[PDB]
Symmetry: D3
Subunit: 241 residues, 6 copies
């Protein structure tokens, strides 16, 4: 049944790789992807949370933890070495540029005007532009790692759609400081700059690049399921708010 939803937005037997694992949106996407039948490899530097995700939110048992710092270079060689031997191909890459980036936690409070003052006092404004570089840097090297596996997913033909790299990001603790939009757009500008350039140079291969920018769990499920599935095989270069 061609346009029955169960066949259109089908991700059954899709081999995805999600950086950050739990993350924020990543979990919201990892849930929506495995639940509908997809091999979701989740990467993170804290294995206990990877293990929590793989066996508390997994509805069919396909979330596969893999410890590794995306920032860490050789750890990326390790993880590509692992998946190439276990599965040999991936179809989706959901890189969270800057999961190894901004501090995901702020010990100081943020409510009283004084708490806000010291938070600004210890935030050097160059850290906002650093958020940019972190996201630009990560998407570049994260895409670089899975480049063979990503096209390998084109040659194995387990899905009608093309291989895809969906890019996301987070601002970490900057979501709780009043100067959050500064960090948000600093992060958004990062992934879009790298994505547009990767799309121009590598969409000519079997990899389309897409962006989801940072709320309900159904908004992201809709997107990730429409984007990676057969329903969204002819969508490349877009940025979804």
């Amino acid at each position: 049944p061609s346009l029955a939803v169960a066949d259109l937005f089908n991700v059954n037997g899709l081999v995805a790789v999600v950086t950050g694992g739990a993350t924020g949106i990543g979990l919201m996407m990892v849930r929506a992807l495995e639940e509908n039948g997809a091999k979701v490899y989740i990467v993170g530097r804290r294995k206990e949370v990877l293990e929590k995700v793989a066996k508390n939110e997994a509805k069919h048992g396909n979330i596969i933890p893999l410890q590794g710092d995306a920032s860490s270079k050789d750890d990326l060689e390790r993880i590509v070495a692992h998946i190439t031997k276990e599965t040999g191909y991936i179809n989706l890459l959901v890189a969270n540029a800057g999961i190894p980036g901004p501090a995901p936690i702020k010990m100081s409070p943020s409510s009283s005007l004084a708490d806000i003052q010291k938070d600004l006092w210890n935030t050097d404004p160059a850290e906002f532009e650093h958020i940019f570089n972190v996201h630009v840097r990560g998407a570049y090297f994260s895409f670089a790692a899975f480049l063979p596996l990503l096209s390998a997913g084109n040659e194995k033909g387990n899905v009608p759609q093309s291989s895809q790299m969906i890019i996301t990001g987070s601002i970490g603790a900057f979501g709780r400081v009043p100067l959050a939009h500064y960090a948000y757009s600093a992060s958004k500008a990062g992934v879009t700059h790298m994505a547009k350039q990767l799309a121009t140079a590598f969409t000519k291969y079997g990899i389309r690049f897409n962006v989801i920018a940072p709320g309900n769990d159904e908004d992201v499920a809709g997107c990730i399921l429409w984007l990676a599935s057969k329903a969204g095989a002819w969508v490349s270069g877009n940025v979804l708010v």
Copy 2:
């Protein structure tokens, strides 16, 4: 949270203008197959009944003869749906179906024919393609404006009532200057859509645009847009 529950259009009372032709057709099919009462409007009942009795997979396609350009015919079709069902949740207006000439007479495949088409089309008809789309999206929403809010009050679906606006370029699609007519139509629906989105989204009605390419793409969009997936989709325009 599985696809069958998220991208469900079950019990959606939609109204797709244009007469289930082209993008319109690909949308009524994808909506009815997955369970929606789709009223289809057009000025030629002969073609309206064919789709209902040829492409409907569950038999929930209800034809309705009417000129969208005619205001009184628009008043009638709203009058019909208000008593038969009393509420609509989706409106897929194809701005400019009562617009550009759908079928082209003269040959379009020769340097002379290309010249012949260029001489006999006044360039203001490109500006007219724009103007028609502004008129259609505006007046189609006005017709179903109460009916659409009834779709929030009957609460048969969690999503907000929605007006998806699209258009066609008619016979201009096989003239070498199609992009001109295309963007003329694209600009029409978007300009009016942002004016309606700004003015009426505060009334619980989302506005969205699908632009004038497999039936798999249109099904994806129309189903992602109208379902609970994509309940927080307002102001977007889809290429």
Copy 3:
């Protein structure tokens, strides 16, 4: 005293001409201008409201009514004929393009969804673009009328500042229909399009052109007093929101 406020934002003995008279903002500006000592001619097609303004809000008695339809062409020749003989020169022109434009009143209500429906039903969408043309058309011909008087205010030297044409507009009853911003930007686009072109061609003479776009009575007083006075003699081409 050069930078004492009473001398900086001084409009004392300034000869202004305000189209619409009461208007909405026009009154708010006519009050701020005469109160601080300026000959304010007010123009409108309904003399009773011109007479009400001139002798209820006038604090020094300088609001001078003058009946006339700005849309009406020969009425403009009449009013320039009158002021050239009475005073012979003007320094400020506050034209409200489209005071002879959109309907300033809507008999139908606007609350119930049905009232909104019929209001849209009887509003042809071409009336929004007509709001544009009305404002573009009016500023052109309104400026045209006072062109001699405006430079006459440069030769008489009653103020250190240059002669000025401040342009405004209103959407009339469209302020009460839900599709108001459509009319607002339709009106704003009108005055700015004509203003930019008049500024390019005629700022090379002694007339700078400025725009105030459509709340408290002090916001407008601040603007009109800062703009037309000596404090704002080197401001041309700006658009004040």
Copy 4:
């Protein structure tokens, strides 16, 4: 090799305003260096006067006709197709119809009688003219590709003038009305018709050599891979 690079020898051009001005300044630079320039203007006395006066090699061919009426347009190419059967360059001056600043009083009445819709009308004519000018010469221009007398592709250089609106203080309004006019239509023709091997270019509105520089750089093989560009 300036003489070989910028060769316009044997170029079949057609300029719709080669007597009005600029057209003239450019028909001269084109014929002098060896291009058969057909000249269009609605007052023929001046077109032939321009010829046998400004032809430095004697290759300037006048023909009476105004660009606004299309009945004149089939007339012109029907003749032009019979002499040569093919054109390579078209320098259309969209808006051939086109349209005492002393004392402010004269200026007041000067604009007092200029309806501002005439500026928007300056726009509309220019959009229509390039469209109908291209529509007229569409076969002949590609025929110039089949005769293969030049290495470059067929070209339509689009321009316009504001005429008497050049004198009113509100000239920039008319200039931009024309500037926006010719470019808007040019972008629609370039996307839709460059895929038929025809480049479109625009020169926007005064020296005898700056314009000559342009017309010769674009019409020569030097300007063979320049399409969609605009030039002041």
Copy 5:
């Protein structure tokens, strides 16, 4: 509603960084003459006291030595005002007074001198002019952030507390590439201003920009901006 009541700065506790020099000077004068307690900050007390004892018309100009680049000196001056007055309503930070070199040594009026200036200025100093302005506006607001809200709580003026940001291009003003340095400074203050305006206007603090030309113009702006006239002026940038 007369000018003397609208454009009043009476009882305004302002703080103007840079040291009452240039636009800063023209602003402290226009503010004190019309009645405002203006604290002036700079790193050279000798020039700070001159303006206080030469250009003050009512004697309400209070000098304060301090490096705006030095954070601890910024902590001191805030500590001083918090006990002496306890509240500020206006902050006129001149971002990059502790920035570009104010005075130029070498001759600037010769093709050789122009070349000499071009060879000895690394082009990253233009990017540095930008970066300094981002740092100054950011950290100056951070210093007085509590103090500024006190100016809303003491209620000595109806307007909201305000941070007006400006800057200087230093010695680059008489180098032929001044516009480069000018816009480098202009971009600095505006980029940071919109980030502060977005983040902190919800705390009752307006942000505005005056860009780096008679003393009559600056008096007009600074007085229109800070007074009750212009109480609803936020997000603007003034050329």
Copy 6:
């Protein structure tokens, strides 16, 4: 008059990359038609090899030097000022340093070792080069106005190349890194230094005649009132 309009006779040019490429394609079109072209490159063996091989009239003068080091820059003009004392054209190739696509695996390691800050670095060098290239020749270029050997004003045409980054699949990144680089500095120089009688122009990054068309149209008197423009 093609031969007189596009006259480059007796033009004192200086191209900083007239051996690398494009520079060569343009030094040729300039010297051949009579312009004394000084050529810069950091490997002199190839610069003199280009001369006495590509000089069609024998007017190509090499000089060893890399544009990045300014110590080389005073060296070059100190010599160039002594031979002639004045320059009219400067075609600077900002970024003279500049910088096996088979199989995806080679490509993975190819980018794996390219730090993305090197693309931003491609930008920075080009901004610095035009600045320091102009700073070097600033006196000599205006001296070319005082010698009055040409009717046109002195000109600095700015270009750059991405070198080996032209081969990585992410070349457009490097191209735009260079394209944005040269134009950003060019706009700052044009506003600040055109008031000193020096026009600035940019050609952005391959035929022997399309580039020749440009370099000759701009360097001639034809391109005398073209300043601030950019050309593909």
